Amino acid sequence: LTSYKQELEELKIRLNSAQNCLPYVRDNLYDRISTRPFLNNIEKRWIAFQILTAVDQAHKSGVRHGDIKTENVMVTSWNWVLLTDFASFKPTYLPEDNPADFNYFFDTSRRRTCYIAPERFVDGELKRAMDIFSAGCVIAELFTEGVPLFDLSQLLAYRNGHFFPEQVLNKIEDHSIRELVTQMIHREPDKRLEAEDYLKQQRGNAFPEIFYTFLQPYMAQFAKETFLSADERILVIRKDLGNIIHNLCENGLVILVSVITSCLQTLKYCDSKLAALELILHLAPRLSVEILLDRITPYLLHFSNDSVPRVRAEALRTLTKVLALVKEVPR
């Protein structure tokens, strides 16, 4: 296992280029399924793009995940889906010798989710085939969240020929997304080593073709350890939002709002918060009937409390006026 420790250290050094890797954060992708459970469809697509990018970047850097899963997918306070915990200690073609150890090590969510190629069964270093199988399994799980397409028992039956994920697939709503995730997820005597082809297929329709080139870039840049402060990061976010608007003339607004909330955890400069509201105000045009109402009220109120009378005054004014234009209401 210790040798696998040096292997994982080298894989982390390699994946350093992989901004989609996170070797505390908000939670795991399955944890985000559980706690803080606002898995928006826009966020989902963004998480899928981030996961495909993380797997491809780890592979290219020289990192094979093998056991990518929703539980294994890391997210930050802004839903930063970053691959990590590459199972260099777990077998590439995992032996079926002991299922007790398989549950004790591979599964950490209690759903026994088995993101392993059936060719990883009975007839060193990791393989991109097992990594891609696990990643497709994690994508399908994100499509079904709680539903493990094949648990330890389910995957064992599939390898032995007793379980089929047809049902769990039915958990996923999007037909094309499920189709691609399953095409990734099959018996893998022929290794679909990398997720680059899937990334290319999704960027046409699923992944933002051009928006991500900027959204993903700003996300990685401001991710953490960024020189600019959260308030400075917010001013830069205002600039980048003007840029995105010019590009156009949910999604980022969703993801952008995600990061705004993530940073909102701290106070920093008061006038900084005032501006943030001012900017957060503009973004609402799309999210009015969405995660905005979901938490925009939450922060706007949380923001409108502290000290400064006129500060909280304008804060409530925004919280409302933005809250106003909505024309539909969730229960």
Curated annotation (Swiss-Prot):
Catalytic residues (UniProt): 67
Domain Protein kinase: 1-215
Places the protein is found: Late endosome; Cytoplasmic vesicle, Autophagosome; Membrane
Ranges of the HEAT repeats in the UniProt entry: 291-328
Post-translational modification: Myristoylated.
Tissue expression summary: Ubiquitously expressed.
Function: Regulatory subunit of the PI3K complex that mediates formation of phosphatidylinositol 3-phosphate; different complex forms are believed to play a role in multiple membrane trafficking pathways: PI3KC3-C1 is involved in initiation of autophagosomes and PI3KC3-C2 in maturation of autophagosomes and endocytosis. Involved in regulation of degradative endocytic trafficking and cytokinesis, probably in the context of PI3KC3-C2.
Subunit structure: Component of the PI3K (PI3KC3/PI3K-III/class III phosphatidylinositol 3-kinase) complex the core of which is composed of the catalytic subunit PIK3C3, the regulatory subunit PIK3R4 and BECN1 associating with additional regulatory/auxiliary subunits to form alternative complex forms. Alternative complex forms containing a fourth regulatory subunit in a mutually exclusive manner are PI3K complex I (PI3KC3-C1) containing ATG14, and PI3K complex II (PI3KC3-C2) containing UVRAG.
Family membership: Belongs to the protein kinase superfamily. Ser/Thr protein kinase family.
Protein name: Phosphoinositide 3-kinase regulatory subunit 4
Annotated source species: Homo sapiens (Human)
Entire protein: shown range: 64 to 453 of 1358
